[PDB]
Write a protein that binds this ligand. Structure first.
Ligand code: ARG
Length: 348
């Protein structure tokens, strides 16, 4: 399986994880000596090793999770490490569960959670897709990066109506175009230490790109962390409008680019935190009263299965659940939770 030199670095990595008595990553938690020993010499048919899985968590001890899938096969071959980490991270996605098939449900039925625009500055729904036939970042060749870019660029550039827009490859992009995209918060940068140590950024910026529509309500990142990160956003709180746009776009893309998908895990993504629906429906929202006590905000959000992140008392608040529920259900959890959070804010 894995080359002797790889196994050697794996042994050193296991020791580092043991050295880090302070470490709280799911990687440390589930990479017992037993599981390590059984997996350390294995290799997928494409050549991915346990090192290609855990290197990021070894290098960055402060990782929360600390593993990534280098190809789809890795989810199966290294299941003894992936499965419990997935179970632990995706709370409530049980051993006996399977992630449901795609179901966007009635996309137009979602409401404006803040019609007055008093709390929510903007609403965004994102998903991620891997492209069928291509492995994840660390197993991609330069040629695959470029071929993927060509296919995606051609597909996106043929979108019409609301979705009509412009594709910009990162390669050779001028500073002026960079500033324009930065000003709209459309540009992504080369991946951070977690992605670097996962070998997720090889050949950067080759095959990396950004697309947005004329209206600036639709944004796609190509080969940032996943092959496709697909995002619908607009000012205010109309989650119905946002989700409808996203689903329309994802459906249109799928006609030309089939996606990698798994019977149990749902849509396959590079990081296992993004599996299942992959959906992250969020508001950027100002809740000055509830934010007087950050710990209280966190507690209340969690009660309604919401996650609080950065994004001046302005929070990115999103659905916490990704696996074991439909896309419709995930957006609905965000919808209902935000409605309830706003009520709490008003009444405090
Ligand atoms: N962008 C992400 N996939 N974030 C979640 C994982 C981040 C990093 N690998 C960690 O374990 O903390």
């Amino acid at each position: 399986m894995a080359d002797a030199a790889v196994i050697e670095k794996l042994e050193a990595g296991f020791k580092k994880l043991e050295a880090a008595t302070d470490c709280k990553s799911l990687l440390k938690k589930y990479l017992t000596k037993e599981v390590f020993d059984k997996l350390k010499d294995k290799r997928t048919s494409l050549g991915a090793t346990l090192l290609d899985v855990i290197q990021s968590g070894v290098e960055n001890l402060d990782s929360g999770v600390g593993i990534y899938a280098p190809d789809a096969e890795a989810y199966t071959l290294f299941a003894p490490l992936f499965d419990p980490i997935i179970e632990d991270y995706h709370v409530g996605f049980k051993q006996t569960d399977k992630h449901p098939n795609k179901d966007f449900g009635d996309v137009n039925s979602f409401v404006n959670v803040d019609p007055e625009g008093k709390f929510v500055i903007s609403t965004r729904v994102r998903c991620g897709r891997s492209m069928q036939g291509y492995p994840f970042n660390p197993c991609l060749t330069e040629s695959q990066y470029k071929e993927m870019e060509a296919k995606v660029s051609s597909t996106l550039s043929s979108l019409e109506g609301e979705l009509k827009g412009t594709y910009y490859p990162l390669t050779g992009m001028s500073k002026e175009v960079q500033q324009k995209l930065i000003d709209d918060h459309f540009l992504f940068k080369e991946g951070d230490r977690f992605l670097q140590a996962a070998n997720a950024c090889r050949y950067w910026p080759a095959g990396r790109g950004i697309y947005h529509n004329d209206n600036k309500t639709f944004l796609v990142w190509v080969n940032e962390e996943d092959h496709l990160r697909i995002i619908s956003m607009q000012m205010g709180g109309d989650l119905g409008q946002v989700f409808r746009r996203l689903t329309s776009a994802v459906n249109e893309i799928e006609k030309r680019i089939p996606f990698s998908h798994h019977d149990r895990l749902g849509f396959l993504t590079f990081c296992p935190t993004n599996l299942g629906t992959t959906v992250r429906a969020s508001v950027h929202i100002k809740l000055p009263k509830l934010a007087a006590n950050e710990e209280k905000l966190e507690e209340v959000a969690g009660k309604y299965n919401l996650q609080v992140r950065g994004t001046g008392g302005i929070y990115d608040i999103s659905n916490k659940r990704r696996m074991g529920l439909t896309e419709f259900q995930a957006v609905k959890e965000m919808e209902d939770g935000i409605l309830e959070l706003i009520k709490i804010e008003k009444e405090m």
